[PDB]
Symmetry: D2
Subunit: 430 residues, 4 copies
Amino acid sequence: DKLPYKVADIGLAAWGRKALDIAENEMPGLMRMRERYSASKPLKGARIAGCLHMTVETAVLIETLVTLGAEVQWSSCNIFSTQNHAAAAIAKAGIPVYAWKGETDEEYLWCIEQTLYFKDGPLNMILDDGGDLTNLIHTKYPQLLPGIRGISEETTTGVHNLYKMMANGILKVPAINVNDSVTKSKFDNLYGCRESLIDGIKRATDVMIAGKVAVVAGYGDVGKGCAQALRGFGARVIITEIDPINALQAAMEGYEVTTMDEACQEGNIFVTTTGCIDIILGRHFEQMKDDAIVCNIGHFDVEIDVKWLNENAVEKVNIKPQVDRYRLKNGRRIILLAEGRLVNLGCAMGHPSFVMSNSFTNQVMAQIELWTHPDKYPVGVHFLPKKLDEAVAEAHLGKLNVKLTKLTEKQAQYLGMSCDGPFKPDHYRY
Amino acid sequence: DKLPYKVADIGLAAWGRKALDIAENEMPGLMRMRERYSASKPLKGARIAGCLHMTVETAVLIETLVTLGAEVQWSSCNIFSTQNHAAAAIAKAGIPVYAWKGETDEEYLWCIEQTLYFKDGPLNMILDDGGDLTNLIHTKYPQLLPGIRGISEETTTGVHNLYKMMANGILKVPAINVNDSVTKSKFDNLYGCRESLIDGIKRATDVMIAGKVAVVAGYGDVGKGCAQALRGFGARVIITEIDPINALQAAMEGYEVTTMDEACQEGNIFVTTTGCIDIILGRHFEQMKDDAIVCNIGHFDVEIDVKWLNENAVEKVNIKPQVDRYRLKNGRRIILLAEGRLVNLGCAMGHPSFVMSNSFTNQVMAQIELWTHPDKYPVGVHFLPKKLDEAVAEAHLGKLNVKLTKLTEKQAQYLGMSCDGPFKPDHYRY
Amino acid sequence: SDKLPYKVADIGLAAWGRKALDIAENEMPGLMRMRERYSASKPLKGARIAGCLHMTVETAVLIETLVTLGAEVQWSSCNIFSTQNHAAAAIAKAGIPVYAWKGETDEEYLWCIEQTLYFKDGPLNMILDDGGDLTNLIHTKYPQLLPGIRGISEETTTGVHNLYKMMANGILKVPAINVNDSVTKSKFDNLYGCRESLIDGIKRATDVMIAGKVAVVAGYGDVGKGCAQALRGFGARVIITEIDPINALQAAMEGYEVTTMDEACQEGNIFVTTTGCIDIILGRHFEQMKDDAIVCNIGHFDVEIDVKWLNENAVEKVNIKPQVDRYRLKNGRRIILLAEGRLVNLGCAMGHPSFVMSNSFTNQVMAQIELWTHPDKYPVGVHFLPKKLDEAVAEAHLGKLNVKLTKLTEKQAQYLGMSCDGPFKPDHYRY
Amino acid sequence: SDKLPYKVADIGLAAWGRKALDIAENEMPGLMRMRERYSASKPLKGARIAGCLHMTVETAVLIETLVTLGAEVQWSSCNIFSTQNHAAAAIAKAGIPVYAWKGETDEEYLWCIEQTLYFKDGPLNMILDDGGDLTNLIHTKYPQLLPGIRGISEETTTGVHNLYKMMANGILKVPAINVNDSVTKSKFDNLYGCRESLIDGIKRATDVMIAGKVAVVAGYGDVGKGCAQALRGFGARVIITEIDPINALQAAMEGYEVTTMDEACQEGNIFVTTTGCIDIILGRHFEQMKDDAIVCNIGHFDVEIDVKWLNENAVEKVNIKPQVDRYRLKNGRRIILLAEGRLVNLGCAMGHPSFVMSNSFTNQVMAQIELWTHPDKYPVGVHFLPKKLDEAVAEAHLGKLNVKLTKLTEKQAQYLGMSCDGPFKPDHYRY
Ligand SMILES: NC(=O)c1ccc[n+]([C@@H]2O[C@H](COP(=O)([O-])OP(=O)(O)OC[C@H]3O[C@@H](n4cnc5c(N)ncnc54)[C@H](O)[C@@H]3O)[C@@H](O)[C@H]2O)c1
Ligand SMILES: NC(=O)c1ccc[n+]([C@@H]2O[C@H](COP(=O)([O-])OP(=O)(O)OC[C@H]3O[C@@H](n4cnc5c(N)ncnc54)[C@H](O)[C@@H]3O)[C@@H](O)[C@H]2O)c1
Ligand SMILES: NC(=O)c1ccc[n+]([C@@H]2O[C@H](COP(=O)([O-])OP(=O)(O)OC[C@H]3O[C@@H](n4cnc5c(N)ncnc54)[C@H](O)[C@@H]3O)[C@@H](O)[C@H]2O)c1
Ligand SMILES: NC(=O)c1ccc[n+]([C@@H]2O[C@H](COP(=O)([O-])OP(=O)(O)OC[C@H]3O[C@@H](n4cnc5c(N)ncnc54)[C@H](O)[C@@H]3O)[C@@H](O)[C@H]2O)c1
Ligand SMILES: Nc1ncnc2c1ncn2[C@@H]1C=C[C@H](O)[C@H]1O
Ligand SMILES: Nc1ncnc2c1ncn2[C@@H]1C=C[C@H](O)[C@H]1O
Ligand SMILES: Nc1ncnc2c1ncn2[C@@H]1C=C[C@H](O)[C@H]1O
Ligand SMILES: Nc1ncnc2c1ncn2[C@@H]1C=C[C@H](O)[C@H]1O
């Protein structure tokens, strides 16, 4: 057969709505999209296979896609990031969901698969976060490929692979790079983490940030957010980078920039925002100070060599779900969070509802683009139009009661731009 | 008879230790006190009645008092601030505890009472936080009074009443003002809140701070912490004050200072750090923007007229424990947290372990002072000696790896002070 | 021949000029790195560079760097108030034609530029511009020297804006490089630079306390962001105006109240225009400001503040000191205008600190080398330096700040699919 | 009679002097409030005030305020470099004996103070001091004028420190008020003031970029806290030294690395001493600093930096500009010393902004009125102004910043057990 869905406890449905209900009032974006397309049903006929953290926010997105008329089946893009009551709320809504906090690698893979086939055929669209879905299809379901009209990726690591794939003649379906949409990378990634990272750490450890030395590997949008968040509370943030520019920026902002080999001997807290392997190794673990807290916030759990801890620790006491305290041979201890998996979602609730409205609004627009205007996106990866990007941002000004200035006719000409149309060059970096 | 204690679930004992175990490694202060007095047992014979938030930190304190040899019976100073696993851990330790998250006003009062009498007589000491215990005895057990050797108060509201009582010839036992001990008011109150306030709000609402207008009533140590914490995340903090100095300080720090009547029409988040009644009234509730989040962090729940909400709201949907969303007659909604009770403890875990080591170290010193040197404290309220106060702070430097400078002989003379003894005048304000 | 070998306020300042350059050079590891790498090869040999960029100490180090690389150079400032005389003199004394001095007149300004167009062996080969005045003058009054010019190198946002406008209207006739939008320029000079120079200009001109006041900053671009942060850094309540949703949203996300000038004009004690356009602060605004509100601009051209309305409607105009005039409007209240609407950091102070400027200028030198040594690589139009060169600029200043960079391991470089040396990010990366 | 009616650098600056005072007065609602409340009553009538406080624009507004209240006044600066000449002149031209000018010599310094001791109708009745030099000079060289003096009014931390030392050693012979430790002074002037003036002094003297550098700040008291925050505000990595656990812990809690000068001397690019004592930066330290490290002090007395070791061990001493000398040690590296170790904000800039100074000085005027009008209320010893007056000072500057204060309701005032008007906090409150 096939289960109509699978969640931890459908009973949480009630509380699920509670949360969604409130999150919707924080997401003027998605809500704006709904009241503008609920009638036209632009996504009619679309069979969207989603593989993005099953959280309250995500649920508002999921229902938005539905209100626009697209069949939808969903699974999380991480085994710990699912929020059960939100998962349940959606299941109860009659939408196939396959996620629950605490999946196993097998169950993870199992869920994605359950979303591939619909009652009337295979997926038409892919709304991915990390590239796992799009990667699975290209590698295990190449047959469904010519049946898919477009890919819509949301995070940096996912988009990174999309470019790699296209670059290697492997990308077989048009995809839109939502992450690098201004109102996403420069808000979600930055502002989002600035608030969710500490959240995850706190809920998991309740340790005081102030007065401690935190080490943050990477100074990209996510690094910048985490770093600022930490010192905001009184921690002395030390930063590592491989890129001169990012590195110089850190130093210009007042952070000491060094190598992990050095900083591993000072940090009381470690956060990897890098997008790559081998950031914190045994060499590092062994020199850390007693009870140093190690966690990652990159998409994939590959930056912290957790296995070395399981394989070299004299003990592994588990304090609570997603929190294990190791005792190395030297006698000192180390607190590892969410087993190296992105801590904000694993140990907290991820990003706040508001900033997520931005990410997801871009996400919905992307889906509408690929589905309603296929002939406008050749196989490859594209960006949403700047004018749409500005729109996303404009949509959240009212909620924050921001009064925008309207460029006068006289001024618009001087500047040589529409008092409405695009306000900046494609290369503008905001 | 008399129950040996009363907690939500003794089963949490295991996890309780987990937490205490880790919190102890963050509290070099209390731990320093233990390894210095565990032998001498300076508190031998003392029968301490404690009435302070039953949290993990508190538990480390409780056991510290015990290691010093004082019989102890405990209850929380607030019905929502108790942390059950920590409560349990202590119960299982054979220490009478009477607290659990979610007590009722009656149960609250019931618990305190259960700590008054010990197996060998009434309390010798009072370790209070808020003045409820000391107030109860002076008003309902004046008979036990001449049996008590000293009071040790920890928070601003408690200490405020101590001065009021002494000033009205009602204070009948020597008390020490721990709150106004430098390393307490200027750290716990300030730094503590800076990290715990957002914690409580987040866990309770997961709302984004950035881009919103937060209103903070009061700019004292607690106000300063909350305000800084909020803008730290990107909120536009508006402040109210009745004191010119505090007011001027705010403005000097860049915050707009106004009256609640004005700010009530702008805030998306409201936090009362005042120590008094009638801060946010119906007048205010009615003008707030949709879904404004209202919470208090003052000791007593008297700053927000919650009753007006229960009495004038068209609805009261309860989202989750300690979170109720009202819908006024005007149609807009209001999210009230912990029913007006101090949000950091009610909706989170309160202050981080580290900063609390400071507060509590002063607390232990106070107890030792009153109990071992009664003849040194006449009826009235006193401060710990500055040299002891400096000690508290010194005790936490190693943990943060701070290398202090030792005033040279030549310099100590120039400055006219002991290279060891007090480094500043009693009036120094740090 | 009559042509003056140069023209500065006082050649006597030459001594002190060196003093300053001497110290600035030790803050500009970039330019200094360029010198010890090309002083021999003389890559700019044969180039006749006509520079039109603020004649400041920093600029002087650049000027000599170009020379060390072997390019004849003639210079003038791109603003009548931004020249630093001792730096101007040092260069004159060095035998390099300079035509600038603090306090030029519109005519003198134009006069200076012209004096740099022709060299002892013919017209300019290159244009190093800041603002587009030089490149604009040639295209409009010397179109025939045009086919003699090999490349344009622009440095500021307003200049680059016109370059795109010109190309877009088939008017751009020489290859130009957009230095401003080079990552290590726009995201450092514009941002970090102002963050430190704006307050400088205001302070030296007024010595007013920032803390406790309401400052209004029009625009939240790289320059706006810098100014805003600088102001609240000192305790001022920064209010921001914007026409762009994104920039606007960012401000709000950073905690600044975003409104319209019409509203904020009634609250500000300090006003700073970082916009790049006309009509930002008008009479409507001036009339509602609070007593002694301080108004200043930091955009390249003095067109954002309607200064003329003040000269034409003020009951008084007392001049406190050079570049500082205090007006008294008919309503009785007063208004303090700085540098007559001209970019305050340079007009009332010394502009950006030496260090961050090393970045800007290093890009500038690289640009010149590119256009001059590899013409066939730049068609008529505006281009960006290669990201790898851009990263280089930044890398060059890491040693001075003692930053230890991490070297991507072989194993890692592959996972990431990038050279442990080559470009570390996509062309669209926004840092 | 020979006695000069005053002595300043150039009386000609009088005009510009007014310009500045005129503007500073509109930033000092405090002093101005005091004037319109006592100009009539002339509460200071008969008082012969001998002032020894930095002769700056702000000070001038104070000086005239004292006069408007009817007190004869004679003045000198409490530092040889802090005098602002045009402000000095304005006052001289006003017919008030001033003896100060930027760049005095130790002898001239002492000479000036002396010229203020005697008035046309006898010796001083009052002492308004900043640093204790005046009060110290009298007690040690003019003990007989002592029983003629009614009260001392001290303003800075170092001065007040000696007052307590003197009283403690039975040497203090006249009632004194500790203005510095008046809440609205130490927690504003000291903190906020430096937060803005320190960078000012450094910038005007060196124009170096703060961002990306490592600054070392010795001491984390009100002045340390201000300096530290100011520096990182611009992007510098602030390292702090302290001898006090509490201050030390606070730094760490605020995110600053706290160490010993011996360690930090090898890292700092900028050094600022906010300590109040001797031997902070020695030869040991100078020798390990990085090339061109900038060393400066902001403590009252120039005793924290062993300048003499530099004059005595440097291979060179090139003087860049007034108050700026660049040394070259034997190791070849250089060191930039500012104002010769003397408080940099005043020595290399204009000191604190007008606004925050209104606070300090308002307390100062109140102090003078107290000692002079209510002698019998101040026994020999050092006292604090009443908290209610202190709150008043602060309240007086709320209007200017447009702060709307909340009025405690009757119902509330009782709950809190305090006057909706009277003192709002305990004497021990630390704000
Ligand atoms: N958890 C969340 O809520 C969330 C939000 C968005 C993105 N992310 C993830 O964050 C990661 C990257 O951040 P961005 O901010 O997304 O991208 P970047 O900003 O593209 O990310 C990594 C940065 O680290 C640096 N870096 C790379 N390898 C390094 C190494 N070995 N050592 C030190 N520094 C190194 C790079 O130069 C780069 O600036 C991705 O994994 C992305 O999916 C997480
Ligand atoms: N929840 C916690 O973790 C924690 C920590 C310490 C103290 N507290 C509590 O915080 C409160 C006070 O803070 P402090 O910081 O303790 O004391 P303050 O700093 O003594 O507290 C209140 C401040 O608010 C101002 N104020 C008083 N009434 C006001 C009114 N009606 N409107 C506007 N402003 C008003 C005062 O001028 C004062 O500066 C007490 O209730 C104390 O018990 C809570
Ligand atoms: N003085 C200096 O040291 C220096 C350094 C670099 C750039 N600049 C100048 O700064 C200006 C622009 O800054 P950037 O930061 O260069 O560019 P942006 O960041 O491209 O500059 C202007 C910003 O203001 C906004 N804006 C435009 N018109 C507006 C109006 N009428 N009202 C309100 N907001 C408006 C735009 O949306 C934009 O974000 C240019 O004039 C450039 O030459 C000066
Ligand atoms: N220049 C100005 O505008 C101004 C304004 C006010 C005060 N001041 C001066 O600032 C100095 C002190 O500051 P405060 O802020 O006035 O006083 P504090 O705050 O009383 O000052 C010094 C601080 O440094 C620490 N300290 C003392 N000796 C030290 C040593 N050898 N090494 C490291 N740290 C040491 C102390 O513990 C103390 O916290 C005095 O000289 C005072 O006159 C200058
Ligand atoms: N609350 C939340 N719901 C859904 N996705 C979230 C989230 N918080 C963070 N994320 C995402 C995780 C990685 C991304 O790039 C970001 O979109
Ligand atoms: N985690 C915690 N444990 C115990 N008391 C706490 C706490 N967080 C805050 N508090 C207290 C609540 C009010 C105080 O003054 C402070 O000591
Ligand atoms: N000291 C200085 N020398 C030269 N140009 C400067 C400067 N400070 C700022 N500028 C420039 C003025 C406008 C630019 O974009 C910026 O590079
Ligand atoms: N502009 C100024 N005028 C007078 N005194 C000033 C000043 N700036 C700073 N100071 C003082 C110098 C030391 C003090 O404590 C402080 O009040």
